[PDB]
Design a protein around this ligand. Sequence first.
Ligand SMILES: NC(=O)c1ccc[n+]([C@@H]2O[C@H](COP(=O)([O-])OP(=O)(O)OC[C@H]3O[C@@H](n4cnc5c(N)ncnc54)[C@H](O)[C@@H]3O)[C@@H](O)[C@H]2O)c1
Ligand SMILES: NC(=O)c1ccc[n+]([C@@H]2O[C@H](COP(=O)([O-])OP(=O)(O)OC[C@H]3O[C@@H](n4cnc5c(N)ncnc54)[C@H](O)[C@@H]3O)[C@@H](O)[C@H]2O)c1
Ligand SMILES: NC(=O)c1ccc[n+]([C@@H]2O[C@H](COP(=O)([O-])OP(=O)(O)OC[C@H]3O[C@@H](n4cnc5c(N)ncnc54)[C@H](O)[C@@H]3O)[C@@H](O)[C@H]2O)c1
Ligand SMILES: NC(=O)c1ccc[n+]([C@@H]2O[C@H](COP(=O)([O-])OP(=O)(O)OC[C@H]3O[C@@H](n4cnc5c(N)ncnc54)[C@H](O)[C@@H]3O)[C@@H](O)[C@H]2O)c1
Ligand SMILES: NC(=O)c1ncn([C@@H]2O[C@H](CO)[C@@H](O)[C@H]2O)n1
Ligand SMILES: NC(=O)c1ncn([C@@H]2O[C@H](CO)[C@@H](O)[C@H]2O)n1
Ligand SMILES: NC(=O)c1ncn([C@@H]2O[C@H](CO)[C@@H](O)[C@H]2O)n1
Ligand SMILES: NC(=O)c1ncn([C@@H]2O[C@H](CO)[C@@H](O)[C@H]2O)n1
Lengths: 430, 429, 429, 430
Amino acid sequence: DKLPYKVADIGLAAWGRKALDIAENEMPGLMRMREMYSASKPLKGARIAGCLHMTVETAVLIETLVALGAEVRWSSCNIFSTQDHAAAAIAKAGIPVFAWKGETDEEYLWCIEQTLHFKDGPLNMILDDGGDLTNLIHTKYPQLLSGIRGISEETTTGVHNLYKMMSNGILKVPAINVNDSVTKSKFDNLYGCRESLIDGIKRATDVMIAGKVAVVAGYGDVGKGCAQALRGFGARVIITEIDPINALQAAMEGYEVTTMDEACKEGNIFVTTTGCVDIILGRHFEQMKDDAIVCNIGHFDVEIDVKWLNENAVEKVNIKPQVDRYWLKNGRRIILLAEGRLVNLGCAMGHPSFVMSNSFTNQVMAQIELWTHPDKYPVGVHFLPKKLDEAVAEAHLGKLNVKLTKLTEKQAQYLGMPINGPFKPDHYRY
Amino acid sequence: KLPYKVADIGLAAWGRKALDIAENEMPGLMRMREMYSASKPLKGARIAGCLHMTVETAVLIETLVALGAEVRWSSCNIFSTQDHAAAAIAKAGIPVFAWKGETDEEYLWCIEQTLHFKDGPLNMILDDGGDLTNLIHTKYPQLLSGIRGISEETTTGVHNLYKMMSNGILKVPAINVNDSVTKSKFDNLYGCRESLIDGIKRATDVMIAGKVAVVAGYGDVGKGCAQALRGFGARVIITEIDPINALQAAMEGYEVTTMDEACKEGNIFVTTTGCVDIILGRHFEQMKDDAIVCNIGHFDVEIDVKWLNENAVEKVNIKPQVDRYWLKNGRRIILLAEGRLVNLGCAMGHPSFVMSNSFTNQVMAQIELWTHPDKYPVGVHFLPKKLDEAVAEAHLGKLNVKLTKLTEKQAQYLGMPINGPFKPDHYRY
Amino acid sequence: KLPYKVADIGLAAWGRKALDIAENEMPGLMRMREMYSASKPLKGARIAGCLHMTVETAVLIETLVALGAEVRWSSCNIFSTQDHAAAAIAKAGIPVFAWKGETDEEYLWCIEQTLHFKDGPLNMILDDGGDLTNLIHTKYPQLLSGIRGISEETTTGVHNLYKMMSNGILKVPAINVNDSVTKSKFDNLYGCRESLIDGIKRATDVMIAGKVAVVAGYGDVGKGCAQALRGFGARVIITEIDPINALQAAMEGYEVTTMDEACKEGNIFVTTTGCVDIILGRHFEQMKDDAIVCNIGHFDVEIDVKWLNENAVEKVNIKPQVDRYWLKNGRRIILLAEGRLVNLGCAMGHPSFVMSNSFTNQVMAQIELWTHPDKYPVGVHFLPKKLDEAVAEAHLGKLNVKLTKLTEKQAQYLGMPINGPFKPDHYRY
Amino acid sequence: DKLPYKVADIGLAAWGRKALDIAENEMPGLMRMREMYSASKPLKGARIAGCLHMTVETAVLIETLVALGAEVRWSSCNIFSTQDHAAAAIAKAGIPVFAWKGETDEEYLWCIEQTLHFKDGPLNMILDDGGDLTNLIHTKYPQLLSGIRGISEETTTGVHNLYKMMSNGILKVPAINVNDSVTKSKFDNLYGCRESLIDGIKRATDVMIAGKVAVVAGYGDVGKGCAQALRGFGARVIITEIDPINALQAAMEGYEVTTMDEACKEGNIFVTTTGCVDIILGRHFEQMKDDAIVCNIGHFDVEIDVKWLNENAVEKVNIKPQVDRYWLKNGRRIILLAEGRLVNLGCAMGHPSFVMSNSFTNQVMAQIELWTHPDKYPVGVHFLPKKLDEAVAEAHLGKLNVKLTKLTEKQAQYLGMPINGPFKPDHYRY
Ligand SMILES: NC(=O)c1ccc[n+]([C@@H]2O[C@H](COP(=O)([O-])OP(=O)(O)OC[C@H]3O[C@@H](n4cnc5c(N)ncnc54)[C@H](O)[C@@H]3O)[C@@H](O)[C@H]2O)c1
Ligand SMILES: NC(=O)c1ccc[n+]([C@@H]2O[C@H](COP(=O)([O-])OP(=O)(O)OC[C@H]3O[C@@H](n4cnc5c(N)ncnc54)[C@H](O)[C@@H]3O)[C@@H](O)[C@H]2O)c1
Ligand SMILES: NC(=O)c1ccc[n+]([C@@H]2O[C@H](COP(=O)([O-])OP(=O)(O)OC[C@H]3O[C@@H](n4cnc5c(N)ncnc54)[C@H](O)[C@@H]3O)[C@@H](O)[C@H]2O)c1
Ligand SMILES: NC(=O)c1ccc[n+]([C@@H]2O[C@H](COP(=O)([O-])OP(=O)(O)OC[C@H]3O[C@@H](n4cnc5c(N)ncnc54)[C@H](O)[C@@H]3O)[C@@H](O)[C@H]2O)c1
Ligand SMILES: NC(=O)c1ncn([C@@H]2O[C@H](CO)[C@@H](O)[C@H]2O)n1
Ligand SMILES: NC(=O)c1ncn([C@@H]2O[C@H](CO)[C@@H](O)[C@H]2O)n1
Ligand SMILES: NC(=O)c1ncn([C@@H]2O[C@H](CO)[C@@H](O)[C@H]2O)n1
Ligand SMILES: NC(=O)c1ncn([C@@H]2O[C@H](CO)[C@@H](O)[C@H]2O)n1
C-alpha cells in the first residue's frame, strides 16, 4: 500500500532518455562496468537504498547497478538537485525513485523513508552522499543495521561523519570512503567544481565574472577548483583558510589569503567551500558591496547564515526559482542563490557526466567490494585498493585518446614495480 | 496596427526584475541616463533597432527612450530573443517585434514593423549585422534620404559597410561601433570568453576538461573562445588564414593547423571567422563520435548545416536548439542552434557588464549622428578616442579601480594632455 | 683610428658559437639573407646603429652587411652589451664600440665613433631610444642632409620622433618599427614575458611564487610582465593612467590601484611606463623589507635612484648591477641595474626568436628608406601591412604552424585579396 | 692528516656571505628554528654527515644545524650543483665542506668519504639527498651502521631507495622521509621546479619558450611544475606517463598525453622528470627537430641516453660549461644540458630560497626528531607528524602577509577538530 515512485512528471521520461543516451557516451567507466559485469551479475541479491542527487549522471549509475543485478530504491540527497527528466526516465524504467526538484524539508525526509523497504525485505546496502541515509538508519532504525552489509559514501562531509561515528563507537556497518579514492577527490571535487560552480552562478544570475572580486572560503579540493574557475574568467580571487598548508598553497598560486572579516568589504561574489558552519554572517552581509552574489557549494545550508537574511532584511524579492534578492536596512541588496544550498546542483546541472563517471565507477566498485567480499571489510571505514583506483582512471583514457606508456621489463626492474602497477606508494598524494 | 508582438506579455514582471539587476551592472548606460535624461539629445529621433532582444538590449532601449528618442525594435537573430526582456519592453509601451524561435519569414516581418512611426518613417538605424541597413538600401531606397545615420554593432556588419562604401552604394553615414576600442577589445574578447561556454553547457552539459576543442579563427572572438576552453582544461587547436593571428596563437601555446587536419581530432568545434565554408561534409565524416559543433561568428554559413540535414541517416531533436545526427559511418554529431550564434541561441549572450561598454558606445554613436550630422558625411566613421576612453572610465568605479592621474611634471615630460587622450590613433591596446 | 673597441676580443670564438645557435632561431633574418645577399639592396648604405649590442643584434648586423651595407655600431645602454657578441662582431671586421659597464661619458664616445666611415659620414640611422637621432639633430646638424632615413626600434624612441615632427624639428624621414604589428604585439609583449623574470632571477634568485608584485603601466610591456609574474604565482597589482588599459587589467583579474597605495604591499616593483617619477622616496619609505625594485621601460628616470643614493644609511654592492640599500627606518631595498633596463642589464634581453620579428622589420625599414626614399618624405611612417604580414609568415615554418589558404569562393565572399593583407588598417589584433 | 675542507676558491666567501644574508631573509622557517633552538642546542652531540647540493640555500641549512649544536661535515650530491661562493662561506666559517662546481666522478666519491670521520668519532647522523651517502655506508662501511642514530632523506628517488632497502631487509638505520612531508613534496617539487627549470634552460641557451613544443616525460610533482612553467610562457606541452591517474590529470589540464615514440618527432624542448632509466634514446634523438634542447631534472644521468650521443654523434661542440651541441649523422643538432644531470641545479641556481626554507625546515625537524627522540623511530622509514608539517607552513605565512583564520569554539566543535589542529586526516592529499 505504498507509492511505487514519486516524481514531478513521468511524461518527461522521453527527454530524460535522450539525455541519458548522451551521458552514457560520456561515461566510459560506467559503461565498462556494464560490459564486464552484466552477465555475471555480481550484485544479485543486493537491495540498495541510494540517497544521491537524482541527476542524469546518477540515472546512468542507477541503471548500471540494476544491470549488475541489484534491486534499487532511490531518493535525492538535496531538495533542489533532482533533474526531473532523469527522475522520470528512472521511474519509467520501473525503478522506485522518490525525487523532484523543489522538495520541502518534510518531503525530503519522506523520500528517504520510501527507499528502506523492498518486496523481499529491508535494504541490505547503502549508497549515500552526505550521510543522511546512514544517519537515519543508525538513529531511527537501529534494528535494520544487522541486515546491512555495507555503506559507500560519496562526499567529504559524509566521510568526515563516518570517521567521527567510528571514533565514537556509533558506526555499526562497514563503509567504503569513495570520496577519498584518488579518482574521486582529485577529479570530481576539483575539476567538477571548476566547471559546475560557474554554470550555477551564470544560470542563476547571468553575471559577468571578469573584473569582479570573488571571495572563496576554503582552499581544499572544492575551493581549489572554484578559485581556478573564477580566476580563469578574470575575477580577482581572495581566499580564506584555517589550515596553514592550504593557505600557503593558495598564496603560492598568487591569491590573496585573508579573513572573511576583511574580505567581506571587498567581494562581489562569495562562494563557501568549507563544510563548516558560520562562514558568512550578519556582520559580513552588512559590509558587502551592493548586489553581492552569495552562494554555497560545500555542505547543507549552514555555511551562510540565511536565517539572518530572512530575519533582518527589509524585504526578500524572489527573482525566479532558487534566486532571491534581499534588500537590507542599509539600502544595499544581497543576491542569494539556492537558499544557501549547493549552487552547482541547485542552480545548474551539477558536475558534467565525464567526471561523474570517475566518481560513480568508484561507487559501483565499492558496492561490489562490500556486497561480494564482506570478509575484507570489517566494521570501520575503508578505501578501495589502489589497483582499482588506477583501473577507474585507465577506463577513461580511451575517450580522451590518451596514449599511456608501458614500462619495459628493464624499466620495471629498475623502478622495482610491476609493469601493470600499482605505480605509486600508498601515501602518494598525486 | 500592433503595439508590439512578443511571445508572452505575462513574462513582463520577471523581465522587469532581470532589467533591474542588469541596470546595476551597466554603469555606462546608467551614466548616459544621469547625464542626458533632462536635456534629451535624441528628441526627434525615430530609431529602428535590429539587435538581439535580450535583457541587456532592453536596458539600451530604455536608455534611448530616456534620452528622448522614439524607438521600434526587432531582434537580429531568430533564436536570440529573451522573451521576458521582450515582454518588459512591450509592457513599457515600446513597440518591439521579437520572440525566441522565429521563422525566417517572421524574422523579416518583424524588421518591417520597425520602419514606420506615427510621425513618419524611421530617421535613425541601430543595427547588428547589417540586415536593417541592407533592407533599406535594397528594398526601401526611397527612405534613405530621411535617415540621418546608422550605428553598427558587429565585425561582420562593419565589414559590409566598408564594402558598400568602396562600391559607392552606401547612402547614409555610419559609425562603426564594433571598432571602438571599448567594444572590440572587450565585448568580442571577454564577452565570448564567458558566453561561449555558457551556450555549450546549457545545450549539452558536456565536460570541457580533457576534450580537444578546435577553434576556427583567432581574431577577437577566437582569442576569447580559445582562452575559455583552455581555462577549463580543453586542449585547443586553432585554424587561421592570417599569419599574424596564427603566430599570436602559436606564441600562446596553441597548435595551429588546418581544419582538414583538425577535424580528425576535435571533440568540440567552434567557428569564429565571419566566413563561409569552414566546416564541411568532408570534415563531419572524419569527426570523433558525438563531436559538438557550433558557430559564434556570423549567420549560419560557417558550418554546412545543409549537408548534415541531407546526408545524416538519423536526426533526433534533443531539446530546443540541440540536434543529434547519426551519419552513415555510424558516428554521431551534435549541432547547436542550427549553426546560428551559440552564445545567444543556447544561452543568454554576453553578460550585462561588458554589454554596457558596447551599448554606451551605441548611445554615443546615436547622439553623434543625430545631433552632429554635418561631422559625418556619407562614409564609415569611428568615435573619437576621447569618447572611447570615457566609456572605459565610466565602468571603473563599479570595479573599484583607482586610476592614477599624471602630475603636471609628468604630463610635460610625456608631452601628453593631462586628461587624455593618452594614446596615439594607431595604438592597438 | 680604432677598428673597434670591445671588452675582450678573446671572447670572439664563444660569441660565434652563440651567434650560430641564434641564427637557427631567427628565420626572418636568415630569410632576408637568402633573398637579398646576391642583389645587395643596401649597397652604398653607411648605417650607424645604436642598439643593445647582444647576440641577437649581432645577427642583425651581419644581415645588414650581407645585404651590402657598411655598418658601425654602438650599444644604446651602458649595461646591455654582451661582450662575446661584441667580440664576434669585432673579429668579423665590423667596427663596434661597446662593452658591458660603460661610463656615461664612454657611452657618448662610442656613439660618436659610429658617425664617420672611410667613404664619408653615415647616411642611415638604425636607432633604439632616439639617442643617435637626437645627437645628430642637436650636435651634428650639418650631417642631416646626408642621412636618407632613420628606423627606430622602441616605443619611447618613436614617441620622441612624433614630438620632433609636430614641433617641426625632425629633419630626416623615419620609419616607426616599434609599431609594426609584428614588433609591438610580439617583442614588447612576449619578449618581456620571458626576459623580465630572467633579469630578476639572475640578479636575485628570488622566489616569485607567493610575492606581491606591483607593475606600473599596462601597455604592451606591462601586459607581458604582469602575465609572467602571475604565471609563477605572484599576486600582481597594476597601476595605470589610461582608463582603457586600466579596465583591461581589471578584466584580467588584476587589482588596479595607485602606487601611493601599492607601495605598501609590493615585494617586487617593475616600472614599464616610459614616464618619469614612478617610484619616489615617499614610496621607498613604505616598502616591505628587501623589496626588489627594477625598471624595464626607459632610461633611469622611472625610479628615483638619486633618492636612494642620497637617503639610504647603508649601500652594499651585492654583485655587478645589484645593490642593497638600508633605509633610516631599518628596512632594506634591493635595486637592480641602477634603475636601467633590467632584462638587458641583469640578463640577456629578449630571446632570439622574438627578436627575429623585430629585426626583420628593421632590415625591411632600412631597405625601404635606402632604396625608396621618395616614398618617405620627412615625417614618421609605418611599414605596409603586406610587409608586416610577411614578417609573421617567415616565422611560421620554424614553429610548424600550418596556415590555411582561403578558397576563391571564400575570398569572394569576404571581398578579401587571397594573399592578403587580411585586415583593415585600423585592426588592433 | 686529512684536508679541513676543499672548495674552488675560499676568496669567494665575502660574496657568499652577502648572498647568505639575502637568503636568510627569504627563509623564515630556518630562521625560526634558530630563534627557537639556538640556546637549548637540541643537536648537541650530533655529528651529521650531509650529502646535499652545496648551494646558498643549503649553506643556510648548514649554519642552522651548527647553531642548534651539531657538528657537520658536508659534500654536494651532484657534480655540477655546488655554488662556489656558498661553499666558500661555509669553509670560511670553519665548517668542513668538500664541494665545488664541476667535480669529476672520482672527486665526487672522494668528497663524500671526507664527511665520515669527525674529531670525536665517526658520523652518527646522515642528511642525504638521493641516497648516495646512505648507500655508501650500508655497502662499504657496515661497521659504522650501529653508531648512526638516523637518516633524513630529501628527494623522491632517495626515499624510493629507502623503502626498497627496508622491504629487502637491507636498511639498518631508522630514516625519516622528508620528501613526503606535505610542505616538501607539494611545494619544493612542484613550485620549485615551476621556477628553476626555466631558469636552467634560459641561462644555458637563452631560448624562447613561446611557440615551442615542449615534451615533459612524467607528470608527478616535478612534471606538474615543469609543464605549468612551460605552458605559462607559451610552449605547447606534450606529456608522457606510465600511470593512468597522472595521465588523466594531465589530460584534464589540457595537455596532450602520448608516448615518447610519437612525441620525439614534434618536441623542440625535452625535459625528463621520471626518476626512471631509458626515457630518451637513440631512436628518439634521430627523429628530433634540429637544435632540440634536451635536459633532465629527475635523477642522476640515466633518463637520457647520453652515452648514445657520445658514441653516435659526428661531433660534440662544447658551447660553454654544461652546454654541448651534438651534430648527428643525419645532419641535425641536439643541444644537451648539464651532461644529462639535474638542469635546474647544474645550469642555474636550483630552487629559490623561500621554497627551500620549507624543505630544509623539515630537514632540521627530522634531524631533531631522530637525534632527540630515537625511541619513536625504530629501523624503518617514517614521516614527520602532521602537526610539525603544519608548523612548517605556518612559519612561512608571515613573510607573505597571509592572514590565517582561527576556528571559533563553535566551529571547532561542529567539525570535531582542535582549534590549533591538525586540521586534516592522515590520508589527506592537499
Ligand atoms: N557541490 C559539490 O558538487 C561538491 C563536490 C565535492 C565536495 N563537496 C563538498 O564540498 C565541501 C568541501 O569539500 P572538500 O573536498 O574541498 O574538503 P576539504 O577538506 O578538502 O576542503 C575544505 C577546506 O575548508 C577549510 N575550512 C574549514 N573551515 C573553514 C573556515 N571556517 N574558514 C575558512 N576555511 C575553512 C579547510 O581547512 C579545508 O582546507 C564538503 O562539504 C564536501 O562534501 C561538494
Ligand atoms: N556571438 C557574438 O556574441 C559575437 C561577438 C562579437 C563578434 N561576433 C562575430 O564574430 C565574428 C568574428 O568577429 P571578430 O571580431 O573576431 O573578427 P576578426 O576579424 O577579428 O577575426 C576573425 C578571424 O577569422 C580569420 N578567418 C577568416 N576566414 C578564415 C578561415 N577560412 N579559416 C580560419 N580563419 C579564418 C581571420 O583571419 C580573422 O583573424 C564576426 O562574424 C563577428 O560579427 C560575434
Ligand atoms: N626592456 C625592453 O626590452 C623593452 C621592450 C619594449 C619596449 N620597452 C620600453 O618599455 C616602455 C613601455 O613600452 P610599451 O610599448 O609598453 O608602451 P605603452 O605606451 O604601450 O605602455 C606604457 C603604459 O604606461 C602607462 N603609463 C604612463 N605613465 C604612467 C604612470 N605615471 N603611471 C602608471 N602608468 C603610466 C600608459 O598609460 C601606457 O598604457 C617604453 O619605454 C618602451 O620603449 C622596453
Ligand atoms: N631537480 C630537482 O630540484 C628535483 C626536485 C624534486 C624532485 N626531484 C627528482 O625528480 C624526480 C621526479 O620526482 P617526483 O617527486 O615528481 O616523483 P613522482 O613519482 O611524483 O613523479 C614521477 C612520474 O614519472 C612517471 N614515470 C615513471 N617512469 C616513466 C616513464 N618511463 N615514462 C613516463 N613517465 C614515467 C611516474 O608515473 C610518475 O608519475 C625524482 O627523481 C626526484 O628525486 C628533482
Ligand atoms: N551531476 C551530479 O550528479 C553531481 N554533481 C556533483 N555531484 C556530487 O555531489 C556531492 C556533494 O553532495 C559531491 O561529492 C559530488 O560527487 N553529483
Ligand atoms: N547579451 C547581448 O545582448 C549580446 N551578447 C552578444 N551580443 C552582440 O551580438 C553581436 C553579434 O551579433 C556582437 O557584436 C555582440 O556585441 N549582444
Ligand atoms: N636581446 C636583445 O637584443 C633585445 N632585447 C630587447 N630588446 C629591444 O630593446 C628595446 C628597448 O631599448 C625594445 O624595444 C626591444 O626591441 N633588444
Ligand atoms: N637550491 C637548492 O639547494 C635546491 N634546489 C633543489 N633542491 C633539492 O634537490 C633535490 C634533488 O636532488 C630536490 O628534492 C630538491 O629538494 N635543492
